């Protein structure tokens, strides 16, 4: 019977990773040998050692039946060890908790309070789709008990069952009725959490749960008045968890109704001025109250107070406070958007902050605050941020800039220029999925093609390693070869497009090692379309297609073979299937 | 004695090779 402390000391004495692994393997072998004999005297020490090994990163597949056997035992220590093993190494995907349903049901009616509480906690932590189905009746039976120490456990079990099985919430509607007068803080918190979970799961109970708004307001007022208490009073805030739950319920209660907002308007006003944010609990309570006011149909004064509190918290030097203020501003983007414009300087400064979370929050706030009038002004700031942004934020910044251009672009020419600049500067940071969106946007726009075609041609001959930019340039060339080069059928004066540089660039891209088989396919399609689109370079792409028909890639080889067959047998029919693709939103 | 084969005396050269 090796104790857990002895195993921990032995592990700490080991230095080499291989030596630690060997010691763990020896301990696991000893534990398996002890379990194979059906040992029950020193089962607690073996269970503790196995749990330590599993937490350390050791396999425990063979130590699954022992936990189940110890769960159905009678010793309190053995029962606790079995419950811990079931909670740690037992899960829905494990499939070993199916036999634990009978043990849980047997222990559900156990007279001991510690055993019943441990079983309820284990069921809540390892809730399964089928375990809750056979245990839903037991959870509802304990929800009507008068045990304060067990009321919270029953509420947690009911909440876990509802979360795992949303269809089982119908059986908890009458169980929680008339439970707003619980004196215990834990029981009241559990009831409030259960009511909030029921309201969030389905909106049918919102009307039924909205009648208790005056009771919740009275409870919150009584808690605020009783600001001194030995229990739940931390950092000068009494029942901070209860206050947070009440604020969350008020924010989620009556979010689209005037009566609910009006009833809690006085409570929200009192909390917004009767709470001190000097400590972390007070700041969290103020943030929760502001979020509830913003998410509910509160009064103009409440919205102004929330905006002032958010602005004050934004100037706070605390990183957590700044992150909370940024999150609140992002949440209150659509709501009070005009009032959020006063923090444009703060949002801009947050991008240069030395906090990754703070910088991300500032970037998100700037992206969400972009409108149809500040889009042009904010475009320069977004471009500067993308150019001098972190590697993990360059792609996100480029995506946000592209989304802003596609949603609130001041003009097609300005939006096209911004997209081209982003593609040129993004390089490998441009997402491949955004390539189809850019292609669709280019196809939809039929007024700016000569300038766009010239820009794409200029940006393509310079570099070709950018997969998204290269694909966009190839698509633009394929779509508007007839417009990029004018009068390029024969020899003419020296212009940007001579009808031969495009073919050479396409051939280099197709044969270049910097091809992922997607840009090469786009280049091949553009070359095939240029046979009818461009009448200057003819009789030369057919040889390349025939040579390109023996490519290593099966898809590329098939495409080359099809192109060669079309060029050699369907020369007159090449233009019959080269019509421009339709443009749709 | 010693494990791995007892030590044996060695000659100076192949006397049969002249």
């Amino acid at each position: 019977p090796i104790r857990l402390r002895e195993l921990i000391r032995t592990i700490r004495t080991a230095r080499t990773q291989a030596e630690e692994r060997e010691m763990i393997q020896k301990e696991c072998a000893a534990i398996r040998s002890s379990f194979r004999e059906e040992d029950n005297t020193y089962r607690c020490r073996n269970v503790a050692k196995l749990l330590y090994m599993h937490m350390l990163g050791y396999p425990a597949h063979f130590g699954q039946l022992e936990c189940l056997k110890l769960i159905a035992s009678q010793k309190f220590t053995d029962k606790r060890i079995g419950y811990l093993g079931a909670m740690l190494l037992l899960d829905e995907r494990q499939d070993v908790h199916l036999l634990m349903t009978n043990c849980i049901k047997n222990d559900l009616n156990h007279s001991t309070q510690f055993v019943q509480g441990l079983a309820l906690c284990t069921l809540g932590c390892m809730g399964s789709s089928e375990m809750c189905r056979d245990l839903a009746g037991e959870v509802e039976k304990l929800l009507k008990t008068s045990n304060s120490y067990l009321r919270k456990k029953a509420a947690l079990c009911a909440v876990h069952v509802i979360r795992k099985v949303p269809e089982l919430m119908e059986m908890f509607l009458p169980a929680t009725k008339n439970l707003l007068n619980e004196k215990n803080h834990g029981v009241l918190h559990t009831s409030v959490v259960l009511l909030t979970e029921m309201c969030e799961r389905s909106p049918d109970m919102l009307a039924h749960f909205r009648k208790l708004v005056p009771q919740l307001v009275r409870i919150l007022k009584n808690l605020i008045m009783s600001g001194y208490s030995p229990e739940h009073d931390v950092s000068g805030i009494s029942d901070p968890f209860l206050q947070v739950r009440i604020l969350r319920l008020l924010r989620i209660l009556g979010r689209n109704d005037d009566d609910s907002s009006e009833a809690m308007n006085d409570i929200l006003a009192q909390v917004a001025t009767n709470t001190e944010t000097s400590k972390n609990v007070g700041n969290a309570i103020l943030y929760e109250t502001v979020l509830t006011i913003m998410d509910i149909k509160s009064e103009s004064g409440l919205r102004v107070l929330a905006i002032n509190i958010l602005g004050r918290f934004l100037l706070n030097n605390d990183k957590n406070i700044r992150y909370v203020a940024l999150t609140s501003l992002l949440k209150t983007v659509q709501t009070d958007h005009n009032a959020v414009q006063r923090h444009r300087s703060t949002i801009v400064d947050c991008l240069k902050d030395l906090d990754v979370s703070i910088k991300r929050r500032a970037m998100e706030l700037s992206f969400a605050l972009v409108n149809g009038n500040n889009i042009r002004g904010m475009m320069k700031e977004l471009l500067y941020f993308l150019d001098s942004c972190e590697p993990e934020f360059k792609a996100d910044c480029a995506s946000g800039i592209f989304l802003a251009a596609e949603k609130y672009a001041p003009s097609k020419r300005w939006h096209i220029d911004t997209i081209m600049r982003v593609l040129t500067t993004a390089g490998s940071y441009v997402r491949d999925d955004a390539v189809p969106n850019l292609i669709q946007l280019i196809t939809n726009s039929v007024e700016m093609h000569a300038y766009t075609v010239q820009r794409l041609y200029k940006a393509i001959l310079g570099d070709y390693s950018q997969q998204p930019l290269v694909q966009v340039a190839a698509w633009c060339i394929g779509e508007y070869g007839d417009l990029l080069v004018s009068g390029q059928c024969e020899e003419e004066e020296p212009i940007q497009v001579t009808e031969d540089e495009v073919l050479d660039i396409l051939e280099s891209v197709l044969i270049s090692n910097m091809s992922t088989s997607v840009t090469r396919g786009y280049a091949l399609t553009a070359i095939m379309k240029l046979s009818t689109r461009f009448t200057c370079t003819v009789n030369r792409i057919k040889k390349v297609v025939s040579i390109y028909g023996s490519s290593i890639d099966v898809e590329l080889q098939q495409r080359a073979v099809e192109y060669n067959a079309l060029f050699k047998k369907y020369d007159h029919m090449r233009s019959a299937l080269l019509e421009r693709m339709p443009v749709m939103e | 004695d010693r494990k791995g084969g007892s030590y044996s005396q060695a000659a100076g050269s192949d006397s049969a090779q002249s």
Binding site: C28, R36, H61 | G4, G12
Partner: protein
Amino acid sequence: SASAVYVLDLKGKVLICRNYRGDVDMSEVEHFMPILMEKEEEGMLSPILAHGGVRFMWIKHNNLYLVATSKKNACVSLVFSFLYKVVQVFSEYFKELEEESIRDNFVIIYELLDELMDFGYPQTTDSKILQEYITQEAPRPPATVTNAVSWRSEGIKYRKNEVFLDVIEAVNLLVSANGNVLRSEIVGSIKMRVFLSGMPELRLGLNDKVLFDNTGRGKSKSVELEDVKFHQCVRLSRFENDRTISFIPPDGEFELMSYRLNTHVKPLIWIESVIEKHSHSRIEYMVKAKSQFKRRSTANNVEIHIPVPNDADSPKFKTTVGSVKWVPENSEIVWSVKSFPGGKEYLMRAHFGLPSVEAEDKEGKPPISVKFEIPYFTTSGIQVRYLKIIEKSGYQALPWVRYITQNGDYQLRTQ
């Protein structure tokens, strides 16, 4: 052409470093640990690291990684040879290769590192020569390094001239799971511990197949070594000219020649393995070992390692000859035998249960290897003719040598 060679630790702390060229900053060693961690976590870890334009080649030592950062395209083979020479010198000077001696002999370690190489070019590599000029407990450099004979120090005086040879045989057999041997090569090892007076020049002579054919005696049992590597003191000119093994023996134990040729004979031990593993119920170990060696030869300290199940427990061994012990750390049962006479047949019957819950991932099938070592056996049949010990002063030498046969890469593929 490493810029600087440093000695690391298991926790990433550099035990000792010594820059040789100065073209690589010493701060690059810190980034070596994260790069190694990333490579190990992704399987891309290699001994020759690359930190941008500077390559940090590292060798896994007993307790620390011998990281040798380099900047240009230096000779990788030369760097590896220098690292091996440094490791050998450290092993000769310090019997323990761990952090205990790294921080205990730094005063002499720095001097040895400075004297070993300068500007990235090694200069001193002889352990005896280094100990004769750098000691941990200084005179002018010895003339042996400056002289041509840097492997035999002159002026050595001994009461008796006794040389202990060792005919080490490595029997490596690669038997696949189908029962056929794929890689069957035996590598010879002629190591002699010469301890005499003066600097005698050994005149090695054995029953070599090439030598017998050249001399016209290619009719008896002659050893035809496919690859033969001479020692540093061995003159390659004589061997290339007429296979004359003439060289100055080193002062102490040294490897003169190391034969290496394929083996076309049957294995010394024939092991048949049976795996009667039930489906999560029990396991059977039908291991039968047959001694193919001569009955006059006994395999001392034979340890045939049979890999048992990773999750197997409660095993029972039913063998006839040799004790079987299951080591949980090794996750296998080794058929340890004290003395295994040739022609012996040992049969074993393993029986152990298995856990009800099946394993989440496979563990593989490691090959079964034996640790047999039967000395006084010459499987190759090569017989040493004579050892020409000649000294300027003139003395009667009494060289000795023993033939030892052991099991090297004798791995049998599992079913």
